Design a protein around this ligand. Structure first.
Ligand code: FAD
Ligand code: PEE
Ligand code: A1EE4
Ligand code: SF4
Ligand code: F3S
Ligand code: FES
Lengths: 131, 143, 596, 236
């Protein structure tokens, strides 16, 4: 990727200036911390009542498990983007890799629609390749 | 215009700030149990997340670009490409990458209520995880 | 050739300790334009190591009027302290701690919600005839630690231009007045010139001129040597306080608060120091009657040791719940450097250099002094002020009382901010001077940088520390003192062949530790001269040949002049003030015989 | 009989910047030295190479100015003991992922600019009437224990992998404990402005609870528990 011009040595100024903080933007602050815990409190019990059963899960119960597992795997790649492809270094190539996760997680929601109406389910596919 | 000529200080300091190196950060730090078990938590979800975005996009593009793909036709294409080792190398590696992320997710639930965050409890819910990936990981390999 | 950078301020403060930080936001709040030049980061100074208390008569325990507090400071000073700075420091002592609690200093609290006060030694009640009073006002055993981190934070609320890691070289004088200070940037290698109207010095003591001191590594006297290079005197340099609670080998300190809560010294024979070589007060006495009770006790073969030359202080009689709540800092300090135990086994003890009750002579409001060449009266230097440990207000006089040195910073840093507000108009044109101002202090930076001799900087510094420990000891006489002046002149003449290996300007730590040796030889060639010229026994200056205290011929301070290293030292004297700021508010205290 | 260790010190020299940073090795006589690493770094500067630069002030462990990387962990060089073993060696490094000024001297300029932004002063509005101090009970005093004893050494900030990369925006575990010292103080009437500069994407929420900071604090503090008490404070 291209690299934006950086600060010469890490800092710019004297030790008696200040780091002015960005304003309150709660939709990526405390409200983003709520969505990371709702999805993680829902894939821990449902994966436990998918290992104790002996066949394919109930078709209504599997769609609840397979859409909570997309939010648990989208919120992970949202943190590997913000940590490594930052906006300091790369600029507009931070919100281009965020757009690629946009139409790579709604086509991945169409695949759940073609798995619970035609085939047996997502966890039925994982049991099929065995493990 | 006597103390605002301290921008003659910023033009000599910023020529010295461009030749400074960065001290080594990895490859010198000693291996601890804090930053190793938290690296296998993020490695587990990246590899298993790519195994979830490559089996769901495949069924999604077949729903628009019309080809038709049953799970049986996927299984007969995946069980023929590889055999022996490969199937017992993918099966044995992914079974241990799931037990260390299951026990990792429950560990980070306790740490988010500010419990077991002493240095004693960090090494106590971290030794009970290492044995846990060696019991439940092998039970998923006899099934 | 170097390139100079000019600055222009109103008041330049040199030092960022406990009394340079209090006078920095005291002036930037009143409406001035200040700067606080420091060699370290402000929360790295030597006042982060203080672990006692700040004495005040706040009321919270028993009953206490500041007039009892005043008599305990004059009695514990052998009547050499001026008895109007005593009257000013103890009167503004309750007001200066309540103001320190409103800044956010987290104090230890009592049952109804007031400040906790322990007891120290020397401070009594009912004019010396009574019990031990509780006036110490202290934050567990990290009082100096939690005092910087509040005073530095409050200094960021008001706009004060901190200049961190700038080594100040000399003073700028034109026709007998101070007009600023020239400094040296350590990160870059540029020479700066600060111009101001009222320069304030709060650099600190010169404790590192001895072999076994309790001070820091940076704790050298650079305020007392910058003043002595300009042609101004220093006062009472022969009163050095020796601490009786220093560890063997390293020189670190355990606090006397452990002795204020039941610490007992146990020698080899196990007999208690009460009647053999000790006063009637057991262990809560002055810091010199107990160091003389140790220095001759290890000499007479009664102490513990492989070389029979140290002691130990027992802390085992206390309950375990009292150590871990009031003094947790000593419970980890003696477990590393001593390395036996703190609670169940005692720790070695040697006498070390602690404090310096001398420096720049000032008045009670902060402005420095000299004397007139023909009349012998005082005179005010225009522009030079001083506060802290590098200034002899003579609040301590001949003996510093326990935990009066943290009250020294808060009150007389607050008074420096008030007397500039009574004289200086904010915003004034600076006079035009020639551009060669300070050219004689840059040529000294180049002579000590392009050096090639036979002795290194770390070889001459060992000959000075070894000489000052043998001859200027706790016990002095007029046969080793006259050899201590003769030896300290021989080491200064070999400073012309010092050797320096680093020839760079960016962080030349071999240059900076050579300029600290030039400043130490100026404060060590005047201590030895002044101590060999006072035939008396008061305070911390005890002469073996003259064992009697004088109240008729030797009740006067000692001033000393020395231009550079390898230059002769002269002496004159000035009279001690024996009257008060007001006669009706507090009566003066007459001299009696001092006995605890 | 002299015992000799082998201390390996990272070296750079800014007036010859085309050279690369390398390690230099000394042979210190172990009998003529103290029991700490700072006592074996000053002996090298006096009786050997005197171009070695480092920071030291108090030799006690209460100033926080000998922060370096001794053996792999971040600790203070005045309270770390030398292994009494003349066969094995020792590698002395600076704090990791910092811009190095000369030898073992980092550039802690971004660290001081971040400590000024959390406003470390009391912000009460109305003081007592008679002019005495501010009342505070003993159980409210005990909340401050383990928070005001930090010495600002930055050994916990330069051990966190989340601070190694994003250090121009993330405050670090040393500053975020001092933003907690003023949040649970009982005599502080300004707390709705302290929980508004941490409510963005990268000031606080880069903490992934990889608890290196608690592991390598040489004063025994807990800077990792005091971050997961701020996250509960902003949420509920
Ligand atoms: C050493 C000590 C002192 C001490 C104590 C325990 C120890 C180990 N316990 C005490 C106690 O329990 N009760 C008490 O009342 N006093 C106690 N003390 C003494 C007291 O701490 C000191 O006397 C006092 O704190 C000294 O403070 P001051 O403000 O006078 O000086 P400083 O703290 O050393 O700070 C001076 C600053 O000056 C700057 N500096 C120095 N030289 C230069 C140069 N050349 N250029 C620029 N700046 C310079 C430094 O930055 C330093 O920070
Ligand atoms: C190779 C599969 C590729 C598709 C997904 C990519 C990899 C995702 C992870 C694959 C490895 C772990 C999943 C499979 C290991 C479990 C073993 C297994 O499935 O063998 C078949 C076995 C059959 O035995 P049962 O009859 O069901 O039980 C009888 C009760 N006595 O099935 C099972 O064990 C349970 C099925 C497990 C489903 C788990 C879902 C895996 C998908 C995870 C995607 C990302 C999730 C991130 C972590 C989630 C948890 C926090
Ligand atoms: C300490 O582990 N590492 C982290 O970099 C990290 C792990 N966590 C939980 N948080 C962070 C921090 F960066 F935010 C690095 C060292 C390893 C790593 C990398 Cl370099 C890249 C990727 Cl994608 C994954 C991983 Cl495991
Ligand atoms: S909190 Fe701990 S690691 Fe951080 S600066 Fe303080 S002592 Fe060092
Ligand atoms: S290691 Fe870093 S991620 Fe948090 S727990 Fe400490 S600040
Ligand atoms: S030098 Fe003061 S802590 Fe190591």
């Amino acid at each position: 990727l291209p690299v934006l011009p950086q600060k010469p040595g890490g800092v710019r100024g004297t030790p008696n200036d200040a780091y002015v903080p960005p304003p309150e933007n709660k939709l990526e602050g405390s409200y983003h911390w709520y969505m990371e815990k709702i999805f993680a409190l829902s894939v821990v019990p449902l994966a436990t009542t998918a290992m104790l059963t002996t066949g394919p899960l109930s078709t209504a119960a599997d769609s609840f498990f397979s859409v909570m597992l997309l939010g648990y795997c989208y919120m992970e790649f949202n943190s590997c983007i913000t940590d490594y492809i930052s906006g300091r270094v790369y600029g507009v190539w931070h919100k281009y890799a965020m757009y690629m996760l946009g139409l790579g997680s709604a086509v991945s929601l169409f695949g759940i629609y073609k798995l619970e109406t035609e085939n047996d389910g997502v966890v039925g596919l994982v049991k099929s390749l065995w493990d | 215009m006597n103390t605002k000529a301290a921008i003659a200080e910023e033009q000599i300091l910023n020529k010295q700030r461009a030749r400074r190196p960065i001290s080594p950060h990895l490859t010198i730090y000693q291996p601890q149990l804090t930053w190793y078990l938290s690296s296998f938590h993020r490695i587990s979800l990246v590899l298993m997340g790519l195994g979830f975005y490559l089996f769901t996009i495949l069924f999604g593009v077949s729903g628009l670009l019309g080809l038709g793909l049953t799970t049986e036709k996927v299984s007969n294409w995946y069980h023929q490409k590889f055999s022996k080792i490969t199937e017992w190398s993918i099966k044995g590696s992914f079974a241990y990458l799931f037990a260390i992320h299951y026990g990792g997710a429950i560990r980070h639930l306790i740490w988010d209520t500010a419990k077991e965050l002493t240095l004693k409890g960090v090494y106590r819910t971290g030794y009970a995880l290492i044995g846990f990936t060696a019991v439940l990981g092998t039970y998923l390999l006899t099934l | 050739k170097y390139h100079i950078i000019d600055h222009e301020y109103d008041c330049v403060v040199i030092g960022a300790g406990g009394a340079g930080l209090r006078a920095a936001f005291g002036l930037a709040e009143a409406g001035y334009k200040t700067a606080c030049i420091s060699k370290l980061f402000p929360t790295r100074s030597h006042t982060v190591a203080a672990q006692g208390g700040i004495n005040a008569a706040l009321g919270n325990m028993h009953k206490d009027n500041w007039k009892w507090h005043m008599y305990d400071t004059v009695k514990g000073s052998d009547w050499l302290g001026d008895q109007d700075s005593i009257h000013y420091m103890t009167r503004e002592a309750p007001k200066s701690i309540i103001e320190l609690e409103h800044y956010g200093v987290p104090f230890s609290r009592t049952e109804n919600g007031k400040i906790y006060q322990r007891a120290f030694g020397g401070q009594t009640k009912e004019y010396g005839k009574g019990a031990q009073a509780y006036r110490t006002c202290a934050v567990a055993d990290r009082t100096g630690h939690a005092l910087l981190h509040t005073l530095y934070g409050q200094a960021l609320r008001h706009d004060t231009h901190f200049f961190i890691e700038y080594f100040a070289l000399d003073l700028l004088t034109h026709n007998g007045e101070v007009v600023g200070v020239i400094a040296y940037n350590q990160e870059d290698g540029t020479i700066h010139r600060f111009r101001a109207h009222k320069t304030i010095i709060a650099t600190g003591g010169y404790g590192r001129a001895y072999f076994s001191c309790t001070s820091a590594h940076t704790c050298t006297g650079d305020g007392n040597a910058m003043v002595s290079r300009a042609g101004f005197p220093l006062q009472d340099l022969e009163f050095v306080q020796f601490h009786p609670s220093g560890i063997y080998g390293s020189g670190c300190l355990i606090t006397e608060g452990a002795r204020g809560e039941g610490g007992f010294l146990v020698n080899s024979e196990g007999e208690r120091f009460m009647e053999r070589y000790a006063p009637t007060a057991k262990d809560l006495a002055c810091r010199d009657v107990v160091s003389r009770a140790i220095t001759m006790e290890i000499r007479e073969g009664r102490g513990v040791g492989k070389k029979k030359d140290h002691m130990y202080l027992q802390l085992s009689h206390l309950p375990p719940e009292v150590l871990k709540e009031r003094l947790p800092g000593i419970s980890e300090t003696a477990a590393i450097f001593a390395g036996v135990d703190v609670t169940k086994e005692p720790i070695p003890i040697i006498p070390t250099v602690h404090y310096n009750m001398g420096g720049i002579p000032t008045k009670w409001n902060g402005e420095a002094l000299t004397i007139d060449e023909e009349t012998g009266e005082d005179k005010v230097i225009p522009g030079l002020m001083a506060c802290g440990e590098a200034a002899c207000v003579s609040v301590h006089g001949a003996n510093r009382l326990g935990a009066n040195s943290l009250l020294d910073l808060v009150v007389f840093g607050r008074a420096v901010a008030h007397t500039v507000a009574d004289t200086l108009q904010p915003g004034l044109p600076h006079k035009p001077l020639p551009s060669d101002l300070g050219k004689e202090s840059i040529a000294n930076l180049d002579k000590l940088r392009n050096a090639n001799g036979s002795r290194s900087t770390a070889e001459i510094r060992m000959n000075m520390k070894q000489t000052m420990q043998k001859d200027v000891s706790v016990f002095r006489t007029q046969s080793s003192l006259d050899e201590g002046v003769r030896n300290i002149t021989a080491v200064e003449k070999t400073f012309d062949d010092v050797k320096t290996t680093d020839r760079s300007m960016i962080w030349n730590s071999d240059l900076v530790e050579t300029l600290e040796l030039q400043n130490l030889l100026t404060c060590a060639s005047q201590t030895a001269v002044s101590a060999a010229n006072r035939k008396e026994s008061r305070g911390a200056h005890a002469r073996e040949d003259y064992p009697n205290r004088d109240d008729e011929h030797w009740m006067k301070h000692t001033l000393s002049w020395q231009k550079d290293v390898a230059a002769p030292v002269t002496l004159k004297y000035r009279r001690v003030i024996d009257h008060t700021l007001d006669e009706k508010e507090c009566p003066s205290v007459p001299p009696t015989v001092r006995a605890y | 009989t002299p015992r000799l260790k082998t201390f390996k010190v990272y070296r750079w020299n800014p007036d010859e910047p085309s050279a690369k940073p390398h390690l230099q090795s000394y042979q210190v006589d172990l009998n003529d030295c103290g029991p700490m690493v700072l006592d074996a770094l000053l002996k090298i500067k006096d009786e050997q190479d005197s171009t070695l630069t480092f920071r030291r002030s108090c030799r006690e462990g209460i100033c926080g100015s000998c922060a370096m990387n001794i053996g792999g962990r971040n600790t203070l060089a005045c309270i770390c003991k030398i292994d009494q073993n003349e066969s094995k060696q020792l590698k002395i490094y600076p704090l990791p992922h910092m811009f190095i000024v000369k030898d073992l001297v980092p550039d802690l300029t971004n660290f001081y600019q971040q400590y000024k932004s959390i406003q470390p002063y009391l912000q009460r509005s109305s003081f007592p009437k008679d002019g005495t101090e501010v009342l505070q009970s003993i159980e409210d005093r005990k909340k401050l224990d383990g928070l005001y004893e930090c010495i600002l050494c930055a050994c916990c900030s330069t051990s966190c992998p989340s601070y190694w990369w994003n250090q121009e925006q993330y405050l670090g575990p040393a500053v975020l404990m001092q933003a907690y010292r003023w949040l649970i103080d009982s005599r502080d009437q300004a707390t709705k402005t302290r929980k508004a500069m941490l409510n963005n994407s990268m000031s606080l929420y880069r903490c992934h609870t990889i608890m290196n900071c608690t592991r390598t604090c040489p004063k025994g503090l807990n800077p990792g528990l005091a971050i997961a008490e701020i996250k509960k404070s902003l949420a509920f």
